[PDB]
Amino acid sequence: MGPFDPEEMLFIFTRCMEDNLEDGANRLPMLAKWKEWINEPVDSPATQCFGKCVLVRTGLYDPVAQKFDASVIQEQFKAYPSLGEKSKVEAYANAVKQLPSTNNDCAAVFKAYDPVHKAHKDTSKNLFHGNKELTKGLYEKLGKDIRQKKQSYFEFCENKYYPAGSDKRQQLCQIRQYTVLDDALFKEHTDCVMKGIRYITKDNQLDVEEVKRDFKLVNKDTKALEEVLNDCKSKEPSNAKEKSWHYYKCLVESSVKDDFKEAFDYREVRSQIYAFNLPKNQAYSKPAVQSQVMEIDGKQCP
Template identity: 30%
Template sequence: MSPVMMMQMLMGSVSGISLQLLCWLCIVGVATVSSVRPPAVSKESTPVALDPDQTSFAFTRSIELYTSGNESSDGIVRAERIRNWSRWHFEESVGSDSQTSCFVRELLSRLELFDVGGGYFRVGQFMAQYKQYKQFLDCSEQEVNDLADKLERHSGLHDCDAIFRVFKESILEPAELLRKLFLLDPESASTVRSYMGSAIRQLNESVFEYCENKFYNDKRDIWCAARNYSIPEDKDFHRHIECIFNGLHYFNRRGDLDVDEICRDFHQVGITDLDNEVSEVLRSCDVNPETKALSYYRCILESDFLDKFKEALDYREIRSADHFYALKVPMPVYDRNQIQSQINSVNRECCSI
């Protein structure tokens, strides 16, 4: 199906929005909760190019954080936001929907294009993306430099509206260039995923499936033991767990543990009273710096909340196969029996647990 046909489908009934379609259209979304804190990036850090999986997550997580509500009226507003942002029709929303400008801030921050704490654009990220993917991009280095120059002159931007104004003036017109650089257009993303192959997680592939295939494709017995929440005696297992922690964003881009992200998975299954306990267990964990993920995982397996962690992680496994899972219309509702059935299906297909 051509991108034009997919766009025509998207512009139709909101209730029929296809998540896979939205993924291919590379939506750019956002915003509802003022308490959400966009990730800050150090000005001193060297820009590192993001891959299609990372930019897709940046987009979808931004929308997920800033859209909510199961009431009928809220659902309509939520669907409208998704539809408008997917077409880059931000002007239509900003007058009546103040969340649009905060969406832009969130997205730019998660793409590591904007430093929220410093109030400036990290223009070096443009060139990092260009150098990494230029063989796949239909744009010139001069175009990238021109866009960076427009943004570099701006500083002291600390509120959503100010950032949004600069976005409209400097980025919105050459939006196609931004989408290409960050692999948010269907052609660039597809080409890069195809080129990178098994080195990157593919569409509809869960984080767990990707990591298991990467390290245990020919060692199914070890894989199956690990899926049963045991720690096998295997030299690659710490790398396998590190792959999962990185894929689930339990480690941030600096390699630090993000306890909030772990607690968030508990919240997704309705467990909201364990934040302090989870934080304390992970804070007091005896961590080997060479095998950090395995150290934290071992502490969780030895904790009193292990069974609840299993439930939370099972749901995250299913959701991780589709960045757009939480953006369905209507909003998906957690069903423990349904998720357990899906997990059992995966286990039956690959293991005998």
């Protein structure tokens, strides 16, 4: 599933923190440390599960094989030669290669990896887009071609496919009101969005749990959603290019369309700042998101 670009690593780090940070007194202290690649407190289940989360999402720990996988490191270095020195990347990969088979529980995985993390902190940090200076440089080089920090993922895709100043821009008026278009350009755009919020995997597969995650975040039950998605999947088209559009269309035209639009609107807001829930997990309120999304509507469709 690697190599990973800066946005992909940002998604992984922030999602893992969102799912693993304690609530209450220790949250802010923990966050401050984890952000700096200080995986402490080492004795905390939250730190241990955070560590496991990152390792699993990157592929550095394979819970099926119950083994660490150093090939992720070499793939990352191959994609980003500027982010490592060969000898040091090799030393890091070697340390991972020589880790023993490890059980798939947070404590076991964290304990096995922690010595490697400490012995190869800078090497791993640089390679996996944790170096602020190096990452800033990559974002600047990439510019409009990658989702930027503090930019809505929806905005990123919209600008890519319906650029400002172009004769295409006007289509955003309908698009942002959940009008399902039929053309190649819209299918490409919808692919960009659906993959960007992880409803569709890099591997072009539906991720029902990600859709469910967003429903739960707007306080909706997911039984109907699962039934809808099950029906949608039995109608999945052969053309891989069309898959994201297929599920978007199916959801928008379905018996859960209102809940879907509510969940998708909130996701848009949260996609604008990946650390949305990190300092404190924010309670959801429908009217506040209503306001924000309407403001974005008037920005993209003036």
